[PDB]
Design a protein around this ligand. Structure first.
Ligand SMILES: CN1C[C@H](C(=O)N[C@]2(C)O[C@@]3(O)[C@@H]4CCCN4C(=O)[C@H](Cc4ccccc4)N3C2=O)C=C2c3cccc4[nH]cc(c34)C[C@H]21
Ligand SMILES: CCCCCCCC/C=C\CCCCCCCC(=O)OC[C@@H](O)CO
Length: 379
């Protein structure tokens, strides 16, 4: 029985048009993300390479799996033969597993960057990124390779004979990566929370000590509030969590919040020199410059407190669960309920995640956002 045989001609052609536009929108949205990393020299960093390889996996899903699926989902019958069926099922398992595992490799990279910044800076290289990507693909192909027990060769479905592999495939491909992502997001969320809580205190110490220099009575009072201000600025500079946007070291970092403390420290040192010279009135007058420099970084400070990197990783985590949790839940309860339409809906729900992810990055990451605005000639 095929439930699709009951669907009318107008609803069938509309369903083909909806599915074909999702497939096309996934291909172009991921093609944009790949080209943007490739074309922009500023984006040639291991972190953006992981975005670019996630976009490559999602592009293969849109070329090897989704077009050839639209017809099978709407008609409900396989007409391409056994050989094409073998490659289609395996490219569905391999690319979707690669898609899921790219997400935790991006999270692993963000976790190490926010949790172990000094030790990781030396290890975060494009060679490291390649080795991790190869491992993801080798693990992806290894998941789809065992159901080749088809010693027998209208219907095209993956081998459901061995319950032990069926659950290993579901765990290795989904349940293990989600538990890793929850743990990874948890540590990242808590890291950023304490990093902005420290940034808030160092910012307040900077503001209050800046008030003291103005209302100072002694030279020793001026000199002390300056060294305290000096220490808080460099502490605020380390407290500020990493941005969502990743740029290569060889790129001008103007109006950057972390740079504001560098020029500010330079000014605090210039003022302490006059204080050590004996020109305290001049050292006090240097606070008028410090006041304006601080005033120019308030907007960049208030921006840091919003933790865009963890916020957007939360939206990706959220988008990943809401897209794949129904599929892998039904995938486990199916051997042990409603019709085959809910399986077709939940497969496409997982497919949709290949489109949601590149639109989340290009709306959130300002490098990808400005690249898009350039593409459609919008200012
Ligand atoms: C989205 N993609 C879809 C794809 C799939 O369901 N393909 C078929 C061809 O479509 C069905 O859903 C259809 C729809 C209506 C009736 N159907 C079935 O009765 C069986 C159910 C089934 C699900 C899982 C395992 C065995 C059988 N279907 C199929 O075999 C397998 C996936 C998968 C399975 C196992 C590990 C995995 N890692 C990544 C993935 C993946 C990607 C992931
Ligand atoms: C159909 C696809 C719709 C998916 C919507 C994605 C979204 O929520 O992203 C917004 C954030 O990037 C905002 O910063």
């Amino acid at each position: 029985y095929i439930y699709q045989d009951s669907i009318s001609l107008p609803w069938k052609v509309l369903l083909v048009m909806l599915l074909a536009l999702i497939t096309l929108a996934t291909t172009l949205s991921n093609a944009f993300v790949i080209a943007t990393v490739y074309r922009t020299r500023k984006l040639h960093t291991p972190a953006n390479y992981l975005i670019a390889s996630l976009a490559v996996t999602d592009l293969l899903v849109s070329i090897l799996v989704m077009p050839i699926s639209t017809m099978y989902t709407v008609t409900g019958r396989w007409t391409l033969g056994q050989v094409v069926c073998d490659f289609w099922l395996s490219s569905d398992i391999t690319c979707c597993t690669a898609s899921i595992w790219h997400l935790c490799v991006i999270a692993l990279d963000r976790y190490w960057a926010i949790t172990d910044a000094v030790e990781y800076s030396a290890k975060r290289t494009p060679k490291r990124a390649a080795v991790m990507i190869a491992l993801v693909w080798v693990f992806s192909i290894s998941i789809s390779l065992p159901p080749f027990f088809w010693r027998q060769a209208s219907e095209c479905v993956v081998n459901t004979d061995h319950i032990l592999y069926t659950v290993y495939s579901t765990v290795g491909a989904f349940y293990f990566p989600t538990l890793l992502l929850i743990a990874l997001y948890g540590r990242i969320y808590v890291e950023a929370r304490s990093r902005i809580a420290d940034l808030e205190d160092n910012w307040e110490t900077l503001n209050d000590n800046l008030k003291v220099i103005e209302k100072a009575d002694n030279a020793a009072q001026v000199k002390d509030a300056l060294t305290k201000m000096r220490a808080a600025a460099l502490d605020a500079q380390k407290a500020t969590p990493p941005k969502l946007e990743d740029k290569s070291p060889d790129s001008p970092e103007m109006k950057d919040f972390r740079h504001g403390f560098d020029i500010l420290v330079g000014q605090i040192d210039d003022a302490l020199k006059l204080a050590n010279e004996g020109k305290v009135k001049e050292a006090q007058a240097a606070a008028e410059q410090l006041k304006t420099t601080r005033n120019a970084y308030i907007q960049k400070y208030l921006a840091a407190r919003e933790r865009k990197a963890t916020k957007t990783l939360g939206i990706i985590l959220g988008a990943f669960i809401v897209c794949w949790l129904p599929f892998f839940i039904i995938s486990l309860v199916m051997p042990i309920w409603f019709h085959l339409a809910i399986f077709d809906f939940f497969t496409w729900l997982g497919y949709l995640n290949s489109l949601i992810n590149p639109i989340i990055y290009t709306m959130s990451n300002e490098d990808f956002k400005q690249a898009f605005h350039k593409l459609i000639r919008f200012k």
